UniProtKB/TrEMBL annotation, chain B:
<protein>
    <recommendedName>
        <fullName>NADH dehydrogenase [ubiquinone] 1 alpha subcomplex subunit 8</fullName>
    </recommendedName>
</protein>
<comment type="similarity">
    <text>Belongs to the complex I NDUFA8 subunit family.</text>
</comment>
<comment type="function">
    <text>Accessory subunit of the mitochondrial membrane respiratory chain NADH dehydrogenase (Complex I), that is believed not to be involved in catalysis. Complex I functions in the transfer of electrons from NADH to the respiratory chain. The immediate electron acceptor for the enzyme is believed to be ubiquinone.</text>
</comment>
<feature type="region of interest" description="Disordered">
    <location>
        <begin position="10"/>
        <end position="41"/>
    </location>
</feature>
<comment type="subunit">
    <text>Complex I is composed of 45 different subunits.</text>
</comment>
<feature type="compositionally biased region" description="Basic and acidic residues">
    <location>
        <begin position="23"/>
        <end position="37"/>
    </location>
</feature>
Amino acid sequence: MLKIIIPTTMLLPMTWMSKHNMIWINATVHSLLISLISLSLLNQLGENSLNFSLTFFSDSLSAPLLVLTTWLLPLMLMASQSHLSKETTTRKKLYITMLILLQLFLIMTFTATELILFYILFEATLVPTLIIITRWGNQTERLNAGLYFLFYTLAGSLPLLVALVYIQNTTGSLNFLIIHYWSHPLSNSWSNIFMWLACIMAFMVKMPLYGLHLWLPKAHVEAPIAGSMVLAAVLLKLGGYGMMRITTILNPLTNYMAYPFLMLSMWGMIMTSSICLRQTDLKSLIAYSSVSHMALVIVAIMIQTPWSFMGATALMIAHGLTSSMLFCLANTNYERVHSRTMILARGLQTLLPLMATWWLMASLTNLALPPSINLIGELFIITASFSWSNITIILMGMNMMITALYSLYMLITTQRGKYTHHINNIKASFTRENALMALHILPLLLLTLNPKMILGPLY
Amino acid sequence: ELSKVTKVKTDRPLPENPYHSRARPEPNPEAEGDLKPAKHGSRLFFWTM
């Protein structure tokens, strides 16, 4: 696995020792090369995981996420080139290094074989994120947003540390393979209930469960574009990956302990989609849409059926791509009008035609249009939940309807109508932004030809 | 001359246990042979060495 870790580390001295006219170019070149190399990790075996060594391993769950991170880093660089153009060279290098450290930490989380190493790195991801959100954010709310995010994550994760150490002491090991083979049923005692909670709430905070989701809108709104990109694409899927990894040792107590979280997510999807129906900030609308989409992944993980896990993996990948692209489009609009108000700039379908097509395709993917992987994941989760209980279909259908409603409402409000008269600074879209949207969309559409790659280890 | 330490030739046996001491407790087992490296190094969580 070091074939990906070592170049990621070498990115730092490269950027630090590169000329001020070549940081972005070199970073993009070698991040894209790293993604190309990490594409080799998709050759997963049917039954056994790829055990590179004692410390790192990868299965059909880790590989798609690793590829997504290695692919998203260049996209973040391209999106963050614009506003970080008048910054000094040292701060640009610092921002690039923060992004690289975040990517490295994400890789080592998705490849870790030890639960405690996974925890260490998955909590280490906070520091680069928090710095990015509180240092290069534009608003004055970036300070409160960073605190909310950091403290929600830590208050969720510290009991997870306690529980992991307790499990290490009792079972003797935290290795995923051993903890999977030497698995044992959990009794219905209060101690097991609280161990289950300690293991679950940490990831429930990460992928925002309805009620613990208040940090996501602040974090996604106040952070810069690249920060929002990671937070939406990978930092939310961290919780899902952790939950899918740890649910092995949390049975059969889950059957009875999942009801509160299942109900919370199945109602919060509707609540957050309705909130999206009545949002005035584009980034806030996208963040609440992300909450609504991750509610389905939470449900799928808490049901623990093979179709649910496949749908969860597919939805994670698809939602990461779609949310990142939506945030990039909103960033372009913001950099054009210097405001995040949705109703401020209207009739953009007549001034930026290709950007309108990008918005249309992104919204279609967001509302789970067949045969996109978004729909593949959503339909798999819906079938799994229907098998779990037939009543679930009502909430699932209502959520789908409201998602289509608010996505098309965003499309109509932004890229339709009469152009805003007074706004005169809307210049023709650059090649960089269009290339960013194309690099967001094309892998997403291509994955529908080979959906088996992102369907998880249970395919 | 009255302060010098003298030898006294007696016939009464020398007391075996003047303090009436109990049996001294058995000492702990004392060490072992040569040292060998730890089986898999420091078995501290994820550290392989």
